Amino acid sequence: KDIDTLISNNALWSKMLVEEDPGFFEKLAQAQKPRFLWIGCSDSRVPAERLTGLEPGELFVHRNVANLVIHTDLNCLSVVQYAVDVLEVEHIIICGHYGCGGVQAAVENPELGLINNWLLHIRDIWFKHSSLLGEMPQERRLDTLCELNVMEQVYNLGHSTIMQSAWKRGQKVTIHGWAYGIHDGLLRDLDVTATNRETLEQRYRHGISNLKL
Amino acid sequence: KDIDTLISNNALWSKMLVEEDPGFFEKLAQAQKPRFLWIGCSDSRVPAERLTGLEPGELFVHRNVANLVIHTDLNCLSVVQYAVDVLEVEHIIICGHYGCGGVQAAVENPELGLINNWLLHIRDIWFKHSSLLGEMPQERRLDTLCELNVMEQVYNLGHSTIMQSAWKRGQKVTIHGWAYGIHDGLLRDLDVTATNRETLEQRYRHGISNLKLK
Amino acid sequence: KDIDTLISNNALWSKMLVEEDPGFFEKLAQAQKPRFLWIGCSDSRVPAERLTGLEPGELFVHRNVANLVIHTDLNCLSVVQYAVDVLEVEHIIICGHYGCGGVQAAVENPELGLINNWLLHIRDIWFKHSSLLGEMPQERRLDTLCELNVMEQVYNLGHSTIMQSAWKRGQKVTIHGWAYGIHDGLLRDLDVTATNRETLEQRYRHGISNLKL
Amino acid sequence: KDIDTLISNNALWSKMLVEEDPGFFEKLAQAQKPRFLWIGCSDSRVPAERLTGLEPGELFVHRNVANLVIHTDLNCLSVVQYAVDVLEVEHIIICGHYGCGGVQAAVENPELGLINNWLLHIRDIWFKHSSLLGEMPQERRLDTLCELNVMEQVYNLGHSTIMQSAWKRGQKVTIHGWAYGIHDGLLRDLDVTATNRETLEQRYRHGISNLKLK
Ligand SMILES: [Zn+2]
Ligand SMILES: [Zn+2]
Ligand SMILES: [Zn+2]
Ligand SMILES: [Zn+2]
């Protein structure tokens, strides 16, 4: 599969649809605003649509290395502000994946270049949860960190001006922390679901509590 | 559809893979590195893997409002630098889409909040090609702006220190600018494809010249 | 002058003041909020205070390479938002300097590393004003670009959500574009002063008009 | 004082230099590169050149709300990378100040607008040392937080790829963490000074340990 394949793939996939499944494009035209914002990793190991069965246009997507929400990344903050205040999504899903290359790179810490600064936000989680991660056998620490990262970015998202204002003014927005494995593509809920400032703190605090012994 | 629906859709998707297509999670077990970086818009009207037929794990992907490549957005630059220097993708594709609401709102300029600052980069492109855009019928402008955007993001991408270093050190990295519409999902090459500094400039200049045509 | 000098410098400069000029620190305690926001270059060839005679605490300062306001730099945008909405400054001054190393680096374009991406925002001005800059003798193009850069960042600052909202709601905020030379430290007004959206566009458009022949 | 005042102050400053101190603009004509990068807070209660007595042209300077060094702020990273790789400064100084309104508002947490997102990085430091901060009298906390901030920004700076690369390739670059108050302008070494990876970690750890003392 080279570039020349992608275009002819597309040209025959579009031609089969207009000939055979015309409602696909008509579904897109009558597609309403998305109700889901998906924040995922650039690895995109399984695409979000196939993972959840969402139709085209039903979800708004952001992706960056290791699905981060940095307090001061305007790229991601601008996706969220537009999602919550303009489109008025009802669910934000943050989704990590076990075996993510960014997360593993943050632990091994090779000299990769510019990307290492982005990843410093994960080394910080790794060191924040040092004792929690220590208590566990070596072979589970990478997937645990993948989970901790997702929980921390849920925590970060809820603490931003976008979500703070939305919840203060009563807008119904729910944040979910998810992860899936490569063996089964089975979504796993990290159980840190937040619907307001109150549940944000309790569920986060409980989420960290369950990983500890 | 609510959240429990997605969970049950996911469960029923997982099983119809492990029984019908077991060589799927195997194909993903083997960490085979993506050959393509797709920079698209968060709108994701038609998912990239559907538009192209690429298997999961064959594309590295970044998505923001209106598929921008801003010279000093560390988020997208981190994605690009990781794709080029670590994964060593051979092709980067910036894909816009006609009818893009980020491009619409840049022009209409409602008071949306934080996002209007992101959108000023698009309004910059609007004003830059004001003349070109005026020589056209009004109904054709928004879509020309969607094409101008992609073409300027390709220009910006080629100018990043990442792309400059890779091209100077001999790494084959080709950059493409595409767009599609909702009526057929047909990909449209904007013809600003670049493989080194010289083609970056000549194809960009050629791309702005061909919109003068009609 | 090494590090050890700076500390003992400070320890005797503070000691002379408390002994001899105590009103300096008492002026600081009763110092009200600043009325000026200064956005300048990291070169800081002449410090802003000596350039204008402002007392300590009278100005709020941001500095970055080549005094830029990028549409989406949250570092600078956050300084401005805090300056305009919290401190309620009355004047924002953007100040470039002839002979700035960032501006010159953007034209010569050496392979400097990470910084070159920041500077791409100036190469863009250089190419935006290609014909205007061409019409002039080679030896004036660098200082002209220094001036164009300042005007463009005034233009950018006025177009941000911070200033747009402030002017819509009637807040009196004035943006100034300044530059000084190294031969005399004489401030030069670029005459693109904006007090609302209307003057923003007229003065910017006139500022570019005066550089052309 | 309004704008015309600054213009006339500037004019009367220029002349009292060219007549009384002509070897000032000469000293600046010679492009002698700064040996110091000062990362301070936009509050600039006492200008850095006054605090230290450094001549103009001897310091490269960056200033933001609460003198932050965020891992992914390209603005400050650009300043640092230019100072270390091009100017080759030998010392970097991050200087906080007691009474800093950015630190105050991080704790008090009013609904200020866009700036609260910048300030979340400080609230992160507050929560991190919650225990340390609680073993102290309340009136001493805000100032301890001002010191904790500087110490964490030094930690962050030392971890940037810029500082990692320079230390690994042998470039003498020393990083310092300082603070001062308004009552005397006396500089206070926070003692987290670092010259390589090993001292970065040990001085940081030692710095958080010594605030447990009293
Ligand atoms: Zn990943
Ligand atoms: Zn779009
Ligand atoms: Zn400069
Ligand atoms: Zn401060």
Side-chain angles (χ1 to χ4, degrees), chain C residues 72-119:
Chain C
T72 48
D73 174 32
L74 202 53
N75 186 319
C76 182
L77 288 188
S78 297
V79 164
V80 181
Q81 198 267 334
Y82 185 79
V84 163
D85 296 355
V86 183
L87 306 182
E88 297 171 0
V89 297
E90 308 178 26
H91 297 278
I92 315 190
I93 296 168
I94 302 191
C95 190
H97 61 119
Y98 309 109
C100 171
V103 174
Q104 168 190 329
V107 166
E108 310 157 321
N109 193 22
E111 177 186 322
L112 296 185
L114 183 62
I115 186 56
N116 273 115
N117 300 292
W118 190 261
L119 297 180

Short mmCIF file of all heavy atoms in Angstrom, two decimals, chain C residues 72-119:
data_model
loop_
_atom_site.label_atom_id
_atom_site.label_comp_id
_atom_site.label_asym_id
_atom_site.label_seq_id
_atom_site.Cartn_x
_atom_site.Cartn_y
_atom_site.Cartn_z
N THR C 72 -1.84 32.28 18.92
CA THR C 72 -2.14 31.13 19.75
C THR C 72 -1.02 30.80 20.74
O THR C 72 -0.90 29.65 21.18
CB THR C 72 -2.46 29.92 18.89
OG1 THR C 72 -1.45 29.79 17.87
CG2 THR C 72 -3.84 30.10 18.23
N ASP C 73 -0.20 31.78 21.11
CA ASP C 73 0.75 31.58 22.20
C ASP C 73 0.07 31.90 23.53
O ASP C 73 -0.15 33.07 23.87
CB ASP C 73 1.98 32.46 22.04
CG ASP C 73 2.90 32.37 23.24
OD1 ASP C 73 2.95 31.28 23.86
OD2 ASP C 73 3.54 33.38 23.59
N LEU C 74 -0.24 30.85 24.29
CA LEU C 74 -0.88 31.05 25.58
C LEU C 74 0.04 31.74 26.60
O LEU C 74 -0.45 32.43 27.50
CB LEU C 74 -1.37 29.71 26.12
CG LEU C 74 -2.49 29.80 27.16
CD1 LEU C 74 -3.66 30.64 26.65
CD2 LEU C 74 -2.97 28.41 27.56
N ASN C 75 1.36 31.57 26.50
CA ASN C 75 2.24 32.32 27.38
C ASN C 75 1.92 33.81 27.30
O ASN C 75 1.52 34.43 28.28
CB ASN C 75 3.72 32.05 27.03
CG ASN C 75 4.70 32.69 28.02
OD1 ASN C 75 4.50 33.82 28.44
ND2 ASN C 75 5.77 31.97 28.37
N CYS C 76 2.05 34.40 26.11
CA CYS C 76 1.81 35.83 25.96
C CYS C 76 0.33 36.19 26.10
O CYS C 76 -0.01 37.20 26.72
CB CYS C 76 2.33 36.30 24.60
SG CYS C 76 2.13 38.06 24.33
N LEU C 77 -0.56 35.39 25.52
CA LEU C 77 -1.99 35.66 25.65
C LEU C 77 -2.41 35.73 27.12
O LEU C 77 -3.26 36.55 27.48
CB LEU C 77 -2.82 34.59 24.93
CG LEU C 77 -2.83 34.60 23.41
CD1 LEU C 77 -3.86 33.60 22.97
CD2 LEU C 77 -3.15 35.99 22.90
N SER C 78 -1.81 34.89 27.97
CA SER C 78 -2.15 34.87 29.40
C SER C 78 -1.62 36.10 30.13
O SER C 78 -2.27 36.60 31.05
CB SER C 78 -1.62 33.59 30.04
OG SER C 78 -2.23 32.42 29.46
N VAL C 79 -0.45 36.60 29.74
CA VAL C 79 0.01 37.87 30.26
C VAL C 79 -0.96 38.98 29.90
O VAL C 79 -1.35 39.78 30.74
CB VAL C 79 1.44 38.16 29.76
CG1 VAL C 79 1.78 39.61 29.95
CG2 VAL C 79 2.44 37.28 30.50
N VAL C 80 -1.41 39.00 28.64
CA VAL C 80 -2.32 40.06 28.18
C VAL C 80 -3.67 39.96 28.87
O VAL C 80 -4.21 40.96 29.37
CB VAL C 80 -2.48 39.99 26.65
CG1 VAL C 80 -3.41 41.11 26.18
CG2 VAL C 80 -1.14 40.06 25.98
N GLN C 81 -4.28 38.76 28.88
CA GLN C 81 -5.57 38.60 29.55
C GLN C 81 -5.50 39.09 30.99
O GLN C 81 -6.36 39.85 31.45
CB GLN C 81 -6.03 37.14 29.50
CG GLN C 81 -7.53 36.96 29.77
CD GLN C 81 -7.84 36.69 31.23
OE1 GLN C 81 -6.99 36.19 31.97
NE2 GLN C 81 -9.05 37.04 31.67
N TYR C 82 -4.45 38.69 31.72
CA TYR C 82 -4.32 39.14 33.11
C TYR C 82 -4.11 40.64 33.19
O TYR C 82 -4.66 41.29 34.08
CB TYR C 82 -3.15 38.41 33.77
CG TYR C 82 -2.95 38.67 35.24
CD1 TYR C 82 -3.74 38.02 36.18
CD2 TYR C 82 -1.93 39.51 35.70
CE1 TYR C 82 -3.55 38.22 37.54
CE2 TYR C 82 -1.74 39.72 37.05
CZ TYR C 82 -2.55 39.06 37.97
OH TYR C 82 -2.38 39.25 39.33
N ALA C 83 -3.31 41.19 32.27
CA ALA C 83 -3.08 42.63 32.24
C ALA C 83 -4.37 43.42 31.97
O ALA C 83 -4.63 44.45 32.60
CB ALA C 83 -2.04 42.95 31.16
N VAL C 84 -5.16 42.98 31.00
CA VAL C 84 -6.32 43.76 30.59
C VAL C 84 -7.51 43.47 31.48
O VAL C 84 -8.20 44.39 31.93
CB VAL C 84 -6.64 43.48 29.12
CG1 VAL C 84 -8.07 43.95 28.77
CG2 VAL C 84 -5.61 44.15 28.25
N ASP C 85 -7.78 42.21 31.76
CA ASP C 85 -9.01 41.89 32.49
C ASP C 85 -8.84 41.94 34.00
O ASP C 85 -9.80 42.26 34.71
CB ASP C 85 -9.53 40.52 32.07
CG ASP C 85 -9.94 40.46 30.59
OD1 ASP C 85 -9.90 41.51 29.90
OD2 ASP C 85 -10.29 39.35 30.13
N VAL C 86 -7.65 41.65 34.54
CA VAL C 86 -7.50 41.62 36.00
C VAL C 86 -6.89 42.94 36.48
O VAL C 86 -7.50 43.66 37.27
CB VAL C 86 -6.66 40.41 36.45
CG1 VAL C 86 -6.56 40.35 37.98
CG2 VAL C 86 -7.23 39.10 35.85
N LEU C 87 -5.68 43.27 35.99
CA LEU C 87 -5.06 44.53 36.39
C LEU C 87 -5.71 45.75 35.74
O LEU C 87 -5.59 46.85 36.27
CB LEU C 87 -3.56 44.51 36.08
CG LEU C 87 -2.74 43.34 36.63
CD1 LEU C 87 -1.23 43.48 36.29
CD2 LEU C 87 -2.97 43.18 38.12
N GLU C 88 -6.37 45.57 34.59
CA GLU C 88 -6.99 46.67 33.82
C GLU C 88 -5.96 47.73 33.43
O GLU C 88 -6.12 48.92 33.71
CB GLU C 88 -8.15 47.29 34.60
CG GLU C 88 -9.29 46.32 34.85
CD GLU C 88 -10.35 46.86 35.78
OE1 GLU C 88 -10.22 48.01 36.27
OE2 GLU C 88 -11.33 46.12 36.02
N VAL C 89 -4.89 47.30 32.75
CA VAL C 89 -3.93 48.29 32.27
C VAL C 89 -4.65 49.18 31.28
O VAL C 89 -5.65 48.79 30.67
CB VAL C 89 -2.70 47.63 31.63
CG1 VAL C 89 -1.94 46.80 32.65
CG2 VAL C 89 -3.12 46.74 30.45
N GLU C 90 -4.16 50.41 31.15
CA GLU C 90 -4.69 51.39 30.21
C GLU C 90 -3.89 51.48 28.92
O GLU C 90 -4.44 51.90 27.90
CB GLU C 90 -4.74 52.76 30.89
CG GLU C 90 -5.45 52.69 32.24
CD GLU C 90 -5.48 54.03 32.98
OE1 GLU C 90 -5.43 55.10 32.34
OE2 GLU C 90 -5.55 54.01 34.24
N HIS C 91 -2.63 51.07 28.94
CA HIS C 91 -1.77 51.14 27.77
C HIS C 91 -1.02 49.82 27.63
O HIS C 91 -0.46 49.31 28.60
CB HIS C 91 -0.79 52.32 27.89
CG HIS C 91 -1.47 53.66 27.94
ND1 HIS C 91 -1.89 54.32 26.81
CD2 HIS C 91 -1.81 54.45 28.99
CE1 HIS C 91 -2.45 55.47 27.16
NE2 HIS C 91 -2.41 55.57 28.47
N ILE C 92 -1.06 49.25 26.44
CA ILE C 92 -0.15 48.17 26.07
C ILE C 92 0.86 48.74 25.09
O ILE C 92 0.48 49.37 24.10
CB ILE C 92 -0.88 46.97 25.45
CG1 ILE C 92 -2.13 46.61 26.24
CG2 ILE C 92 0.07 45.81 25.40
CD1 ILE C 92 -2.75 45.27 25.79
N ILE C 93 2.13 48.52 25.35
CA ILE C 93 3.16 49.01 24.46
C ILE C 93 3.88 47.80 23.91
O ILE C 93 4.36 46.96 24.67
CB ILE C 93 4.14 49.95 25.16
CG1 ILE C 93 3.38 51.19 25.63
CG2 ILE C 93 5.28 50.28 24.22
CD1 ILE C 93 4.16 52.05 26.56
N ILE C 94 3.92 47.69 22.59
CA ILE C 94 4.78 46.71 21.95
C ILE C 94 6.01 47.45 21.44
O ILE C 94 5.88 48.46 20.74
CB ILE C 94 4.05 45.97 20.82
CG1 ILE C 94 2.79 45.28 21.38
CG2 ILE C 94 4.97 44.96 20.16
CD1 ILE C 94 2.16 44.32 20.41
N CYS C 95 7.20 46.98 21.82
CA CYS C 95 8.43 47.72 21.54
C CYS C 95 9.46 46.80 20.92
O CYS C 95 9.94 45.87 21.57
CB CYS C 95 8.99 48.35 22.81
SG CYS C 95 10.34 49.52 22.48
N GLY C 96 9.81 47.07 19.66
CA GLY C 96 10.90 46.39 19.01
C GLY C 96 12.17 47.22 19.09
O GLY C 96 12.19 48.32 19.64
N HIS C 97 13.26 46.66 18.56
CA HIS C 97 14.51 47.40 18.53
C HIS C 97 15.29 47.08 17.26
O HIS C 97 15.49 45.92 16.91
CB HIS C 97 15.37 47.12 19.78
CG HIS C 97 15.78 45.69 19.96
ND1 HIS C 97 17.11 45.31 19.98
CD2 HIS C 97 15.06 44.57 20.19
CE1 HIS C 97 17.18 44.00 20.18
NE2 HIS C 97 15.95 43.54 20.31
N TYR C 98 15.71 48.14 16.58
CA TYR C 98 16.59 48.03 15.43
C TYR C 98 17.86 47.25 15.79
O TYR C 98 18.50 47.54 16.81
CB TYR C 98 16.95 49.42 14.93
CG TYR C 98 15.74 50.28 14.72
CD1 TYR C 98 15.45 51.34 15.57
CD2 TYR C 98 14.87 50.03 13.67
CE1 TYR C 98 14.34 52.12 15.39
CE2 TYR C 98 13.77 50.81 13.47
CZ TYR C 98 13.50 51.85 14.33
OH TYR C 98 12.38 52.64 14.12
N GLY C 99 18.22 46.30 14.94
CA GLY C 99 19.37 45.45 15.21
C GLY C 99 19.05 44.25 16.07
O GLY C 99 19.98 43.62 16.60
N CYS C 100 17.77 43.93 16.25
CA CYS C 100 17.38 42.78 17.05
C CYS C 100 17.91 41.50 16.42
O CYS C 100 17.76 41.29 15.22
CB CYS C 100 15.85 42.77 17.17
SG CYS C 100 15.09 41.31 17.92
N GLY C 101 18.53 40.64 17.24
CA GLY C 101 19.13 39.41 16.72
C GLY C 101 18.12 38.38 16.22
O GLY C 101 18.42 37.60 15.31
N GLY C 102 16.93 38.35 16.81
CA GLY C 102 15.89 37.46 16.31
C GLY C 102 15.44 37.84 14.92
O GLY C 102 15.31 36.99 14.04
N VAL C 103 15.24 39.14 14.69
CA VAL C 103 14.77 39.60 13.39
C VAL C 103 15.80 39.31 12.32
O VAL C 103 15.49 38.79 11.24
CB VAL C 103 14.43 41.10 13.47
CG1 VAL C 103 14.07 41.64 12.11
CG2 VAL C 103 13.29 41.31 14.49
N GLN C 104 17.05 39.62 12.61
CA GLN C 104 18.12 39.33 11.68
C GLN C 104 18.28 37.83 11.45
O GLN C 104 18.53 37.40 10.32
CB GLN C 104 19.40 39.95 12.23
CG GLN C 104 20.64 39.52 11.54
CD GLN C 104 21.85 39.97 12.30
OE1 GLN C 104 21.82 41.02 12.96
NE2 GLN C 104 22.92 39.18 12.24
N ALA C 105 18.15 37.03 12.50
CA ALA C 105 18.23 35.58 12.31
C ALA C 105 17.10 35.09 11.41
O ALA C 105 17.29 34.14 10.64
CB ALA C 105 18.20 34.86 13.66
N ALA C 106 15.93 35.74 11.45
CA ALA C 106 14.83 35.29 10.60
C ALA C 106 15.11 35.55 9.12
O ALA C 106 14.58 34.84 8.27
CB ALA C 106 13.52 35.95 11.05
N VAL C 107 15.94 36.53 8.79
CA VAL C 107 16.24 36.83 7.38
C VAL C 107 17.39 35.97 6.87
O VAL C 107 17.29 35.36 5.81
CB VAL C 107 16.54 38.34 7.20
CG1 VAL C 107 17.17 38.58 5.85
CG2 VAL C 107 15.30 39.15 7.33
N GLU C 108 18.50 35.97 7.62
CA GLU C 108 19.65 35.14 7.27
C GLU C 108 19.32 33.66 7.33
O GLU C 108 19.85 32.85 6.56
CB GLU C 108 20.81 35.44 8.22
CG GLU C 108 21.16 36.91 8.40
CD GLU C 108 21.88 37.16 9.71
OE1 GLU C 108 21.50 36.52 10.74
OE2 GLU C 108 22.81 38.00 9.73
N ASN C 109 18.49 33.27 8.28
CA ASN C 109 17.97 31.92 8.37
C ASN C 109 19.05 30.86 8.58
O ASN C 109 19.11 29.88 7.83
CB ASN C 109 17.17 31.63 7.11
CG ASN C 109 16.35 30.41 7.25
OD1 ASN C 109 16.04 29.99 8.37
ND2 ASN C 109 15.99 29.80 6.13
N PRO C 110 19.90 31.00 9.59
CA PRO C 110 20.83 29.92 9.90
C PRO C 110 20.11 28.77 10.60
O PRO C 110 19.00 28.91 11.12
CB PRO C 110 21.85 30.58 10.83
CG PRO C 110 21.06 31.66 11.53
CD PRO C 110 19.93 32.07 10.61
N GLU C 111 20.76 27.61 10.58
CA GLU C 111 20.19 26.41 11.17
C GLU C 111 20.45 26.45 12.68
O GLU C 111 21.41 25.89 13.21
CB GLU C 111 20.77 25.19 10.46
CG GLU C 111 20.35 23.83 10.98
CD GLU C 111 21.12 22.69 10.29
OE1 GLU C 111 21.38 22.78 9.06
OE2 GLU C 111 21.47 21.69 10.97
N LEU C 112 19.56 27.14 13.40
CA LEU C 112 19.78 27.39 14.82
C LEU C 112 19.11 26.37 15.74
O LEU C 112 19.45 26.30 16.92
CB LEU C 112 19.27 28.79 15.21
CG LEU C 112 19.87 30.08 14.63
CD1 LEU C 112 19.23 31.29 15.31
CD2 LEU C 112 21.38 30.14 14.81
N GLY C 113 18.17 25.59 15.23
CA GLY C 113 17.47 24.63 16.06
C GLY C 113 16.04 25.03 16.36
O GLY C 113 15.39 25.64 15.51
N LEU C 114 15.57 24.73 17.58
CA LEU C 114 14.16 24.87 17.95
C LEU C 114 13.64 26.27 17.68
O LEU C 114 12.49 26.44 17.26
CB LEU C 114 13.98 24.53 19.42
CG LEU C 114 12.55 24.56 19.93
CD1 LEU C 114 11.76 23.52 19.19
CD2 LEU C 114 12.48 24.33 21.44
N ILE C 115 14.47 27.29 17.94
CA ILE C 115 14.09 28.70 17.85
C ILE C 115 13.62 29.07 16.45
O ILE C 115 12.84 30.01 16.29
CB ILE C 115 15.30 29.57 18.27
CG1 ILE C 115 14.92 31.06 18.32
CG2 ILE C 115 16.44 29.37 17.30
CD1 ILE C 115 13.75 31.33 19.21
N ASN C 116 14.08 28.36 15.42
CA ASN C 116 13.71 28.72 14.06
C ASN C 116 12.20 28.65 13.83
O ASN C 116 11.67 29.35 12.96
CB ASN C 116 14.44 27.83 13.05
CG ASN C 116 15.82 28.36 12.68
OD1 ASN C 116 16.83 27.72 12.97
ND2 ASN C 116 15.87 29.51 12.02
N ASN C 117 11.49 27.81 14.60
CA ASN C 117 10.04 27.75 14.40
C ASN C 117 9.39 29.03 14.90
O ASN C 117 8.52 29.61 14.22
CB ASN C 117 9.46 26.52 15.09
CG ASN C 117 10.03 25.21 14.56
OD1 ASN C 117 9.79 24.83 13.41
ND2 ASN C 117 10.82 24.53 15.38
N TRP C 118 9.80 29.50 16.08
CA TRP C 118 9.34 30.79 16.58
C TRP C 118 9.55 31.87 15.53
O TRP C 118 8.62 32.60 15.17
CB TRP C 118 10.07 31.12 17.87
CG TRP C 118 9.51 32.30 18.60
CD1 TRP C 118 9.97 33.59 18.57
CD2 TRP C 118 8.40 32.29 19.49
NE1 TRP C 118 9.19 34.39 19.38
CE2 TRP C 118 8.22 33.62 19.96
CE3 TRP C 118 7.53 31.30 19.93
CZ2 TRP C 118 7.21 33.97 20.84
CZ3 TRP C 118 6.52 31.65 20.82
CH2 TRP C 118 6.36 32.97 21.26
N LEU C 119 10.76 31.92 14.98
CA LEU C 119 11.13 32.94 14.00
C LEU C 119 10.37 32.81 12.68
O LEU C 119 10.33 33.78 11.92
CB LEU C 119 12.64 32.87 13.76
CG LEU C 119 13.50 33.18 14.98
CD1 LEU C 119 14.99 33.10 14.64
CD2 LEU C 119 13.14 34.55 15.53
#
